[PDB]
Amino acid sequence: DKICLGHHALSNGTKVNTLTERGVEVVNATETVERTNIPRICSKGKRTVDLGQCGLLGTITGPPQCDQFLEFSADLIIERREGSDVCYPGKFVNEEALRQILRESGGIDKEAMGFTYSGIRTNGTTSACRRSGSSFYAEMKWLLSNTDNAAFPQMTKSYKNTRKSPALIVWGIHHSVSTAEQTKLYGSGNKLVTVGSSNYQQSFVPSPGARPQVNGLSGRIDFHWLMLNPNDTVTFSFNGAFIAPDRASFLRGKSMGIQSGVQVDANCEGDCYHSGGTIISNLPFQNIDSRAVGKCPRYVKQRSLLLATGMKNVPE
Amino acid sequence: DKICLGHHALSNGTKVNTLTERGVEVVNATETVERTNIPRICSKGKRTVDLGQCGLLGTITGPPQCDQFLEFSADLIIERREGSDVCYPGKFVNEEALRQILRESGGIDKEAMGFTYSGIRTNGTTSACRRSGSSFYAEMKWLLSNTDNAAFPQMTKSYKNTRKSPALIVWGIHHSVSTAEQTKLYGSGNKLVTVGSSNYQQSFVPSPGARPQVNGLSGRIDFHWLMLNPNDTVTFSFNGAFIAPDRASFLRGKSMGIQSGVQVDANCEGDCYHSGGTIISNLPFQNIDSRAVGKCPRYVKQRSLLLATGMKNVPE
Amino acid sequence: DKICLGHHALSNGTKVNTLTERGVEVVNATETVERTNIPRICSKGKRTVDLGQCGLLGTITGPPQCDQFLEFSADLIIERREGSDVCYPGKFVNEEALRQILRESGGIDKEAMGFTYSGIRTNGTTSACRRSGSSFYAEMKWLLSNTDNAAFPQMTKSYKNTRKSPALIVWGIHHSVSTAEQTKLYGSGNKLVTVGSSNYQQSFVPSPGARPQVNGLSGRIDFHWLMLNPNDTVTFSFNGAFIAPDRASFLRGKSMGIQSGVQVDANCEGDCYHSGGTIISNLPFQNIDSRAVGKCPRYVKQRSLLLATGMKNVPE
Amino acid sequence: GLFGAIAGFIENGWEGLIDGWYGFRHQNAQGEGTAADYKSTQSAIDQITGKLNRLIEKTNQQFELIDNEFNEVEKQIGNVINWTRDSITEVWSYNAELLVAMENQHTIDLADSEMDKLYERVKRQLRENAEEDGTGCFEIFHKCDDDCMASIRNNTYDHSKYREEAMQNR
Amino acid sequence: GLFGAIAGFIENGWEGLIDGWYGFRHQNAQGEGTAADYKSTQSAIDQITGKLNRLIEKTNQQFELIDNEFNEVEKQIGNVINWTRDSITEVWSYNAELLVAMENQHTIDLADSEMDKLYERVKRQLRENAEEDGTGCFEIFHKCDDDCMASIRNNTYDHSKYREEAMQNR
Amino acid sequence: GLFGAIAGFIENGWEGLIDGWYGFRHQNAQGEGTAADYKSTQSAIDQITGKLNRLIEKTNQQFELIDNEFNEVEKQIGNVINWTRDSITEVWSYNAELLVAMENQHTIDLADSEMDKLYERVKRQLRENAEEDGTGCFEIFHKCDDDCMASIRNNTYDHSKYREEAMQNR
Ligand SMILES: CC(=O)N[C@@H]1[C@@H](O)[C@H](O[C@@H]2O[C@H](CO[C@]3(C(=O)O)C[C@H](O)[C@@H](NC(C)=O)[C@H]([C@H](O)[C@H](O)CO)O3)[C@H](O)[C@H](O)[C@H]2O)[C@@H](CO)O[C@H]1O
Ligand SMILES: CC(=O)N[C@@H]1[C@@H](O)[C@H](O[C@@H]2O[C@H](CO[C@]3(C(=O)O)C[C@H](O)[C@@H](NC(C)=O)[C@H]([C@H](O)[C@H](O)CO)O3)[C@H](O)[C@H](O)[C@H]2O)[C@@H](CO)O[C@H]1O
Ligand SMILES: CC(=O)N[C@@H]1[C@@H](O)[C@H](O[C@@H]2O[C@H](CO[C@]3(C(=O)O)C[C@H](O)[C@@H](NC(C)=O)[C@H]([C@H](O)[C@H](O)CO)O3)[C@H](O)[C@H](O)[C@H]2O)[C@@H](CO)O[C@H]1O
Ligand SMILES: *[C@@H]1O[C@H](CO)[C@@H](O[C@@H]2O[C@H](CO)[C@@H](O)[C@H](O)[C@H]2NC(C)=O)[C@H](O)[C@H]1NC(C)=O
Ligand SMILES: *[C@@H]1O[C@H](CO)[C@@H](O[C@@H]2O[C@H](CO)[C@@H](O)[C@H](O)[C@H]2NC(C)=O)[C@H](O)[C@H]1NC(C)=O
Ligand SMILES: *[C@@H]1O[C@H](CO)[C@@H](O[C@@H]2O[C@H](CO)[C@@H](O)[C@H](O)[C@H]2NC(C)=O)[C@H](O)[C@H]1NC(C)=O
Ligand SMILES: *[C@@H]1O[C@H](CO)[C@@H](O)[C@H](O)[C@H]1NC(C)=O
Ligand SMILES: *[C@@H]1O[C@H](CO)[C@@H](O)[C@H](O)[C@H]1NC(C)=O
Ligand SMILES: *[C@@H]1O[C@H](CO)[C@@H](O)[C@H](O)[C@H]1NC(C)=O
Ligand SMILES: *[C@@H]1O[C@H](CO)[C@@H](O)[C@H](O)[C@H]1NC(C)=O
Ligand SMILES: *[C@@H]1O[C@H](CO)[C@@H](O)[C@H](O)[C@H]1NC(C)=O
Ligand SMILES: *[C@@H]1O[C@H](CO)[C@@H](O)[C@H](O)[C@H]1NC(C)=O
Ligand SMILES: *[C@@H]1O[C@H](CO)[C@@H](O)[C@H](O)[C@H]1NC(C)=O
Ligand SMILES: *[C@@H]1O[C@H](CO)[C@@H](O)[C@H](O)[C@H]1NC(C)=O
Ligand SMILES: *[C@@H]1O[C@H](CO)[C@@H](O)[C@H](O)[C@H]1NC(C)=O
Ligand SMILES: *[C@@H]1O[C@H](CO)[C@@H](O)[C@H](O)[C@H]1NC(C)=O
Ligand SMILES: *[C@@H]1O[C@H](CO)[C@@H](O)[C@H](O)[C@H]1NC(C)=O
Ligand SMILES: *[C@@H]1O[C@H](CO)[C@@H](O)[C@H](O)[C@H]1NC(C)=O
C-alpha cells in the first residue's frame, strides 16, 4: 500500500554550534583546532644546528663554548637556555636585532679582516675564557699598550668589503674595574673610539668602574656591530680600550631559528615549532602556543571548534 | 469556501542591509554598534587610585604631590592631565615603558636599599620641592661634596635583591646650570657614573649648561631605572652628580591603568574605559573611541549596523 | 501537448570556487583582485613636489641641490633614489621619524631664529657644498673660533616659539678629521653642547677621528632635531663644534609622501601609489604591492579570485 | 527571499495579525476569521533570538594602553602603533559589515522558509479535498464550518471524512 | 544547488535562450517556440548586481609609509613592521578567499531558487489542467494554441475556461 | 533546517539505515523492506567532503620570532609586540568561530535539501498513481510488489502502466 522516505540516525550524535544554535547534535563531526603536541623538534630532512652551550651571538666572536660553531651552516637553528654569548663578562648593543639576522642567515662564513699592528700588544687573555689555560674570543684580539701605563697611539685601521653580500662586523669596548686599571692597560687620558660607514656614524668613549663579579670578574666588554655593504669601507679610530675584530662574517643564505628545551628528532618532519616541540597538523587552527613559528595553523583561544560533517541527528 | 495563509506586517519597517540589497525594510531590527557613553569612570567594586596632581612616575621618586602615593595598592589606576612626575625640573629616560610597568603593577611596596655614606653630604634640598620649607624627593638623596669645591671620592655602593620578585631601581643625574656650579657641588674633573646588573650594562657622564627656567630653575635631574632580578646584585660607581636611591620598589600584583578627565563613580560598573568615560555595553562593536582599553567591544568606523530580528516587511 | 521550463547556458563557462567545490563553471564571472598597474605617478589635481636630487631632510638644512625646496608646499611629495640630504658628509639622528613628519607636513614655511653672534666666526664653508665656489647649508651657520687654535667662549642662545603650531628645530655637530683639527677650529679642551625643552632633555660631546672619504672628505656633521611647542623656549649651551640653525621650519598642513622611480603624469588620477606606479581600481583587493600607500584595495597573496555573476553553467 | 513566499506568491502581510508572525485567515458560511500559528511563529522567533545571544556577547580579552594622550610617545614607535591600530580597525569594520549583511540575508530567507513550511503542511493535510489558489490560499470544495477550520489549524483535520463530498464537487 | 532545479530535475540549459536567463519552450499544433521570462531574469540580475555594487568599492581609509625602500629602517623595528604586515596580509588573504567562496555558493543557490519559483508559479496557474512531466515540463491535456501559450507566459491564463475538457482528458 | 524535511515533516531518522544517508522503506503484499539511495547519499557526501578539503589546509606563509623567551626584549617594544599579537589572536578567534558556525548552518540545510530533492523526485515519478501521506510517505493505490518497488528506487517505474487501476482506486 505504501513507500516511505527517511534518513539515517544514531542514538547519540555529536554536539556542534551554528549561527542559530548552541549544541545541536549531528551524525558526524570533526575537529578544526589542533591540540596535539609532539614533544620533540622534528628535524627530518633539515640541516640542523643545535647550539647547546654556545650562545648564538657567540658564533660571531668565539668564546670557547662556540669553537665548533664559528662557520656553521643550517636550515634550522636551535637556541638553548644554557647558551652563553660570552666568556669574559659583557653584552651586545642592539642584541636582539642581531639575533634575528643570524636566525635566518643560513649560517656564517668567516674571513680575515687583514689588520696588522705596530707599537702595541695584541695577545691579551683572561681566566674566564679557558682553552687549556687562559685565552680569549677566537675571532677577536685584545689590543693593549706595549707595557704597563704606556701610551696607546691614536690608530686608524680600515677594511673594505670586496664581496657581493653585506659583511657583519663586530668590535668590543673593554671597561676595566677601575680608573687605575684602565691607565695600566692603555695609558692615561680620555680614550675615544669612532666608527664610520656609508650608512653608519657613531662614537664610543669608555667608562671604567666597579661591577658585580660575574665569572669571578668585575670588568665588562661591550660588543658593537654593523652591516657593511659591498664596496663600502669602514674605519676604526681608537685611543685604546678597544677589542679588535680579526675576522668578518658573511651570511650563507636562508634559515629559521627557534628557542627550545626539547630533544631533536630526525624521525619526524614538521614546519611549525615552539619551545615545547612541534605542531604536526593540517588543521587550520591551533590552541597550543600563540608564539609558535614556521608554517603554522593560526592560533586561536578556543580549545575546540567542531565542524559538522553529517546531517542533524534526529533519533527515534 | 477557502482558507488563506499570511504573515504579519507594519505600515513602516526598519531599513537594514543584506548581501544583495541596501535598505530593505524588515519588521524589527537591533543595533550592533555601541554609541552610548557614560561620562564617568565606573569603578564600582574596584580598588581605585586617582593620582590627581601626582604623576605616575613620581610615585617611585616622591615629589611632595606624591607623598600619599608612595606605597599605593590598586586594581585601577587613573592618570590626570594635571599630574606631574617631578618637583625639581627633570625627566625619566625610557619613561613610557616604566609607565606601562606601573599601570599594571597593582601598585607598589617600598623597602630601604641600605646605603650608608662617609666623607660626603646627603641632605641636599631645593625650593622647587616644598614641604614647609625646602625639601627633596622623599625616596631619593641628593649626594654632595662635604663643602664647596671639595672633591667627591670615587664611591662604590651595592644592593642585592633578596626577594622573590624583581626590584624596580631608580637613580638620578644632576646637571647643574653651569660648569662652575657643578664643581662647587661635586668638585672639578670629569664625573662618571656606571651601572651593572646581570641583564644591564651602562654609564653616565653629566653635562652642565643653561636650560630654560622651569619652576624658576634652570638645572635638570635625569632619572634612570632598571628591573633587578631575584638574587641579582647591582652596583653604583660614581664620582659625583648622582641622586642616590633610598628605597626600592616592588610590584604588588595586577592592575590596569587609564588616562581620563572625568569623575570617578562607584555607583556604576564597567570594564571598558577611555578618556571621556566608560563604555557599558554587551554589543560586539563600538564607535566611541578606537583607543578604549580594558575589556571592550571592537572599534569600528561605522556609526550604525542594524541586525534584522524580523522578517521582510511587506505592507498592504 | 506541453510547455517546458529552462534556463540559459553556454558551451563553455567560467570556473570559480565555492564553499563546496573547486572550479565549478558558471555563465559569467568577474575579477575581485587588481593586477593592472599604471607605470606613472598619477598626480592630476594634486599639488605635487618631485624632490629629484634633493633629499627630503635636506629641505630643512639646505644643501645646494635643495635650494629650490626650502619652502615647498604640497599635497603629494615624491622621494627619488638619487636624492641626497647632505652636501658635507653627515647624517640625521632619528632620521626616519623626521621623514615621516615631513611626508605628511603639507610642506614647510621658514622663519629666522634671530641668533646674533659676538666673539666668534659664523661664515664657515667647504668644497663639498658648491654654489659658484665653496658654500654651506643655506639654513645653517658653521660656528667657528675667531682664529686658529683660539678659544671658543661658552655660549647660551635661546629661541621662543611664538606661533600657534610646533616648530621644527635642527642643529648639527661637526666631528673633525683629527684631534688636532678640532682644536684648530674651536680651541682645545672637552667641548660640550646641551639642549633643553619642556619635552626634551639631552647633551652632545663630539668625537673627532678618521672616517672614510665621502665627497673627498673624511669629516662628518651629525644633524639633530626636536619639535618645539607653542610658547615653549629652547636653549643651546655650546663650547664649540656646533652647526647653528639660522631658520626654523613650520608645517603647512597635510600631505602624503611616496618613494618612486617612475614619471609623474597629470593626465591620470589615482590615490593608491607604490614605487612602480599607481593602482587605479575599484576592486576590493590587489596583488601588486603589499607596501602600496594612500587609499588602496587590500593586499592579498592570490593573483585572482573570481566572483560568480551568473548561474551554474549546464551545457547540452 | 529564496523560498518565494514572503514578497513572493503571497501578495503581502497582514497588519491585523498582531497575534504572531504567521497565521490563517478563513472564509465560510459563518464569515471571516483570523488566527495565529504558534509553532511556526515560535520556530522563527527561537532561531532569531539564538542568533542574537550568540552575537550579543563581549570578549573577556583585556587590552592595555600602548601610547599616551598626555605625553606623546616617540614619533617612529607612535607611527607604527597608529598604522597597526588603523589596520586592525579596517579589519573589524569589514568583519562587522559582512557579518550583519550575511546574517540579515539568512534571517530574511529563514522567515520566508518558515512561511513555506507552514503553507506546505496545510496542503499535505487536505489531500485532494482542496486545490491551490496560487495567492497563498486553499479553495475548499466541501463545507468547512468554524469547527472544521479550527481542526485544520490544530492539526486534527481528518481528510477521509470529507473526501467523497469534496472529490465529487471537483 | 539547494533547490534542485538547475543541474537537478532540469537536465540542462538552453544555448538558444539568448533572450534572458529563464524561459519557456512549448510544443503544440502550430509547432515549437521559445521565449524568455522577464520577471525571473530581472529578479536574479538585480540581486547579483546588488552584490557587486556592495563589494566593488574601495575604502576612504588612508595609510602612510612606516618603512623605507631606499634607506632601510633599523632592523628590530623593521622586523616588527614586516611581521605585522605579513600578519595582516594573511588575514585579508583569508577574508578574500572566504568572501568569494560563500558569495559564489549563494549566487548559484540564488539562481537555482529563481528557476524553482518560476516553475512553481506556472504549476499554480494550471490547476489540474496539467500534470508534471518531471523533467521541468508540463503536459497539457486540453488544446493550447500559440494564443493560449502566450497567456500562460503573461500570467493571464484562465484555468476555469479549459478545466472541463482537460479534466475529462485525464 | 530551511527545507523542512529533516526534523520537519519527517518525524525522525532510521537507526537501521546503515547502508547510506537516505533511503526507502516500503510496505506491500510481500511485507516490509528498506534500502539506501546511492545518488542522494553520494551528492551530500561529495559536497561535505569538498568543504573539508577546502578548510583542512595550512598556509605556506612563514613567520619568525620577533621576541625572546630566554632574554626578554626591551619593555616598550615588547608591549607593542604583545598588543599586536593579542589583537591578531582576537581576529583569528573570531574568524574560526564564525567560519565553523556558518559552515555548520549550511551543512545542516544542505542535508535537509538533499532529502527534499529525493522526496520530490519520487512524487514526480508517481504522477497521480499515489498521494502524499504527509509524514514523508506515499500511499500507492495500485498493487506494487517487490519488483515494482525496486523500479521506483532505480528510476525505471512507468506510471502509465499502472495509471488506470490506481486512478480508479482513488
Ligand atoms: C700576573 C699579574 O700581574 N697579577 C696577578 C693578578 O692578576 C692576580 O689577581 C687575580 O686577577 C684575576 C684577573 O686576571 C686577569 C684575568 O682576567 O684572568 C689576567 C689577565 O692576563 C688580564 N688580562 C689583561 C689583558 O690585562 C686580566 C685583565 O687585566 C682584567 O680582566 C681586566 O678587567 O686579568 C682575577 O681578578 C682574580 O680574582 C684576581 O685574584 C693575582 C692573584 O692571583 O696574582 C697576580 O700575580
Ligand atoms: C644660600 C646661598 O648660598 N645662596 C643663595 C642663593 O642660592 C640665592 O639664589 C637663588 O637660588 C635659587 C636656587 O637655590 C637652590 C634651590 O634649588 O632652591 C637652593 C638649594 O639649597 C641648592 N641645593 C643644593 C643641593 O645645592 C640648589 C642647587 O644648588 C641648584 O638648584 C642647582 O641647580 O639651589 C634660585 O636659583 C633663585 O632663582 C636664586 O635667586 C640668593 C638669592 O635668593 O641668595 C643666596 O644667599
Ligand atoms: C686654505 C688652507 O688653510 N689650507 C688649504 C687646505 O685646506 C687644502 O687641503 C685640502 O682641504 C680640503 C678641505 O678644505 C675645506 C673644505 O671642506 O673644503 C676648506 C674649508 O674652508 C674648511 N672649512 C672650515 C670651516 O674650516 C674645511 C674644514 O676645515 C674641514 O672640512 C673640516 O673637516 O676644509 C680637502 O680636505 C682636500 O682633500 C685637501 O687637499 C690644501 C690643498 O688644496 O691647500 C691649503 O692651502
Ligand atoms: C597617532 O594618532 C593619534 C590619534 O589617534 C594622534 O593624536 C592626535 O593628534 C591630533 C593632531 O595633532 C590631535 O588633534 C588629537 O588631540 C590627538 N589625539 C590623541 C588621542 O592623542 C597622534 O598624533 C598620532 N601619532 C603620531 C606619531 O602622529
Ligand atoms: C622587510 O621586508 C622587505 C620586503 O617587503 C625587505 O626588503 C627586501 O629585501 C630583499 C632581500 O634583501 C630585497 O631583494 C628587496 O629589494 C627588498 N624589498 C624592499 C621593498 O625593500 C626587508 O629586508 C625586510 N626587513 C628586514 C628588517 O628584514
Ligand atoms: C608579553 O607576553 C609574554 C607572554 O606571551 C610575557 O612573558 C611571560 O611572562 C609571564 C609573567 O612574567 C611568565 O610567567 C611567562 O613565563 C612568560 N612567557 C613567555 C613565553 O615569555 C611577557 O612578559 C610580555 N611582555 C611584556 C613586556 O610584558
Ligand atoms: C552516547 O552515550 C554514550 C554513553 O556512554 C557515550 O559513550 C557515547 O560517546 C555517546 N555517543 C556519541 C556518538 O557521542
Ligand atoms: C566521521 O568523521 C571523522 C572525522 O573525525 C572521520 O575520521 C570518520 O571517518 C567519519 N566516520 C563516518 C562513519 O563517517
Ligand atoms: C704578547 O706579546 C708580547 C710582544 O708583542 C710578548 O713579549 C709577550 O710575551 C706575549 N704574551 C704572552 C703571554 O706570550
Ligand atoms: C664593486 O666595485 C668593483 C670595482 O673594483 C666592481 O667590479 C663591482 O662590480 C662593484 N660592485 C658593486 C655592487 O658596486
Ligand atoms: C513610519 O513613519 C512615521 C512617520 O512619522 C515614523 O514616526 C515611524 O518611525 C516610521 N515607522 C518605523 C517603524 O520606523
Ligand atoms: C524589537 O527589537 C528590539 C531590539 O532593539 C527589542 O527591544 C524589542 O523588544 C522588539 N520588539 C518586538 C515587538 O519584537
Ligand atoms: C647637612 O649635613 C651636614 C653634615 O653632614 C650638616 O652640617 C648640615 O647642616 C646639614 N644641612 C642642613 C640644612 O641641616
Ligand atoms: C636565591 O638564593 C637563596 C640562597 O641564599 C635561595 O634561598 C633562593 O632559593 C634563591 N632563589 C633564586 C630564585 O635563585
Ligand atoms: C571555451 O573554449 C574556447 C576554446 O578556444 C575558448 O576560447 C573559450 O574561452 C572557452 N569559453 C569560455 C567562456 O571561457
Ligand atoms: C559578464 O561580466 C563581466 C564582468 O567582467 C561584464 O563586464 C559583462 O558585461 C558581463 N557580460 C554579460 C553578457 O553578462
Ligand atoms: C668670515 O668672517 C671674518 C670676520 O668675522 C672675516 O674676516 C673673513 O674674511 C670671513 N670669511 C670670508 C671667506 O670672507
Ligand atoms: C602664548 O602666550 C601668549 C601670551 O603672550 C598668549 O597670547 C597665547 O594665547 C599663548 N598661547 C598658548 C597656546 O599658550
Distance in Å, alpha carbon of D57 to nearest chain F alpha carbon: 12
CA distance B133 to B136: 10
Please, how many CA atoms are within 13 Å of residue C22, restricted to the half-sphere of its CB?
Answer: 6
Beta strands C108-112 and F130-132: pairing type? unpaired
Written in H, E and C, the secondary structure of A289-309 is: CCCCEECCCEECCCCCCEEEC
CA distance B56 to A42: 48
| Domain residue spans of chain E | 1-170
Ligand closest to the CA atom of residue B164: 14
Q: Is A123 in the pocket of ligand 9 (CB under 6 A)?
A: yes
Which fold, D1-170? Hemagglutinin Ectodomain; Chain B (3.90.20)
CB atoms within 10 A of CB E136: 22
Distance in Å, alpha carbon of E76 to nearest chain A alpha carbon: 5
The SS3 of residue D44 is helix
CA distance B279 to B285: 11
CA distance E129 to E113: 25
Ligand closest to the CA atom of residue A29: 8
Nearest CA in chain C to E55: C284
Mutation for F interface: D2, D55, D66, D128, most F CBs within 10 A = D66
Tell me the residue type at B114. Answer: G
Put simply, whether B190 touches C (Cβ < 8 Å) is yes
Nearest CA in chain A to F118: A5
Distances (CA, A) of A45 to A72, A75, A261, A269, A274: 17, 10, 21, 7, 18
Distance in Å, alpha carbon of A234 to nearest chain B alpha carbon: 25
Q: Is C73 in the pocket of ligand 16 (CB under 6 A)?
A: no
Q: Please enumerate in sequence order all residues whose Cβ is within 8 A of that of B298, keeping only pairs 6 or more positions apart, or say none.
A: B284, B285, B286, D92, D95, D96, F90
Query: What backbone torsions phi and psi does residue C43 show, to the nearest 5 degrees?
Result: -120, 15
Nearest CA in chain F to C21: F50
Residue A164 Cα: closest atom of ligand 10: 13
C-alpha of residue F46 to centroid of ligand 7, in Å? 27
CA distance D55 to B34: 13
C-alpha of residue C180 to centroid of ligand 3, in Å? 14
Put simply, whether F68 touches B (Cβ < 8 Å) is no
The SS3 of residue D8 is helix
**Listed residue (C175, B313, B254, D34) closest to A194, CA to CA:** C175
**Listed residue (E111, E139, E145, E116) closest to E126, CA to CA:** E139
| CA D46 to mean position of chain CA atoms | 10
Pocket of ligand 4 (CB under 6 A): D 69, 75, 78-79, 82
Q: Is A121 in the pocket of ligand 9 (CB under 6 A)?
A: yes
This PDB structure is determined at a resolution in Å of 2.3
- H helices of C123-260, where? 179-186
Distances (CA, A) of F142 to B292, F111, F130, F138, F155: 74, 32, 8, 12, 18
Q: Please enumerate in sequence order all residues whose Cβ is within 8 A of that of C157, keeping only pairs 6 or more positions apart, or say none.
A: C115, C235, C236, C244
Q: Is B36 in the pocket of ligand 2 (CB under 6 A)?
A: no
Q: Please enumerate in sequence order all residues whose Cβ is within 8 A of that of E26, keeping only pairs 6 or more positions apart, or say none.
A: C2, C3, C4, E32, E33, E34, E144, E149
Contacts of D51 in chain A (CB under 8 A): 19-20
Which CATH number is B282's domain given? 2.10.77.10
Contact B259, B186 (CB under 8 A): no
CA distance C229 to C166: 4
C38 shares a domain with C148: no
Residue corresponding to grid cell 533519533? A315
Angle between helices F38-55 and F75-126 (to 10 degrees): 170
C-alpha of residue A160 to centroid of ligand 10, in Å? 12
For atom 8 of ligand 15, which residue has the closest CA?
Answer: C12
Please give the torsion angle defined by the CA atoms of residues B82, B86, B90 and B92, in that order, rounded to the nearest 10 degrees. -90
Written in H, E and C, the secondary structure of B79-124 is: ECCCCECCCCCEEECCHHHHHHHHHCCCEEEEEECCCCCCCEECCC
C109 shares a domain with C185: yes
Q: Is B147 in the pocket of ligand 13 (CB under 6 A)?
A: no
C-alpha of residue A303 to centroid of ligand 7, in Å? 21
B117 shares a domain with B10: no
Cross-chain Cβ contact D4/E128 below 8 Å: no
CB atoms within 10 A of CB F158: 11
| CA C290 to mean position of chain CA atoms | 19
Contact C140, C245 (CB under 8 A): yes
For atom 10 of ligand 14, which residue has the closest CA?
Answer: B231
Distance in Å, alpha carbon of E75 to nearest chain A alpha carbon: 6
CA distance F170 to F159: 15
Cα-Cα end-to-end distance for chain A: 23
The experimental method behind these coordinates is: X-ray
The SS3 of residue B130 is strand
Ligand closest to the CA atom of residue C122: 17
For atom 14 of ligand 8, which residue has the closest CA?
Answer: A28
F69, with CB counted inside 10 A (0-12, 13-18, 19+), is middle
Distances (CA, A) of F133 to A1, A5, F3, F15, F140: 11, 11, 18, 22, 10
C-alpha of residue F79 to centroid of ligand 6, in Å? 10
CA distance C211 to D167: 110
Residue corresponding to grid cell 500562460? E152
A287 shares a domain with A244: no
Mutation for E interface: A19, A92, A100, most E CBs within 10 A = A100
Site to substitute for ligand 16 among C16, C28, C30, C282, most atoms within 8 A of C-beta? C28
Contact C140, C61 (CB under 8 A): yes
B108 shares a domain with B3: no
Q: Please enumerate in sequence order all residues whose Cβ is within 8 A of that of B246, keeping only pairs 6 or more positions apart, or say none.
A: B112, B113, B115, B139, B140, B141
Q: How many CB pairs under 8 A join A and D?
A: 14
For residue B127 the three cell numbers come to 625650593
Q: Is B12 in the pocket of ligand 11 (CB under 6 A)?
A: yes
Q: Is B121 in the pocket of ligand 13 (CB under 6 A)?
A: yes
Nearest CA in chain E to B17: E54
Cross-chain Cβ contact C196/B220 below 8 Å: yes
Q: Is A73 in the pocket of ligand 1 (CB under 6 A)?
A: no
CB atoms within 10 A of CB F49: 12
C112 shares a domain with C8: no
Contact B162, B129 (CB under 8 A): no
Cross-chain Cβ contact B20/E47 below 8 Å: yes
Cross-chain Cβ contact D51/A19 below 8 Å: yes
CA distance C107 to C60: 10
Query: What backbone torsions phi and psi does residue E95 show, to the nearest 5 degrees?
Result: -55, -45
Contacts of B307 in chain A (CB under 8 A): none
Mutation for B interface: E42, E48, E51, most B CBs within 10 A = E51
Number of domains in chain C: 2
Domain that holds residue B16: 1-46+263-316
Cross-chain Cβ contact C295/E137 below 8 Å: no
C183 shares a domain with C293: no
Contacts of B298 in chain F (CB under 8 A): 90
Distances (CA, A) of C65 to A199, A309, C80: 20, 69, 13
Q: Is C315 in the pocket of ligand 15 (CB under 6 A)?
A: no
Nearest CA in chain D to A301: D61
C128 shares a domain with C200: yes
**Listed residue (E149, C9, A122, A283) closest to F59, CA to CA:** A283
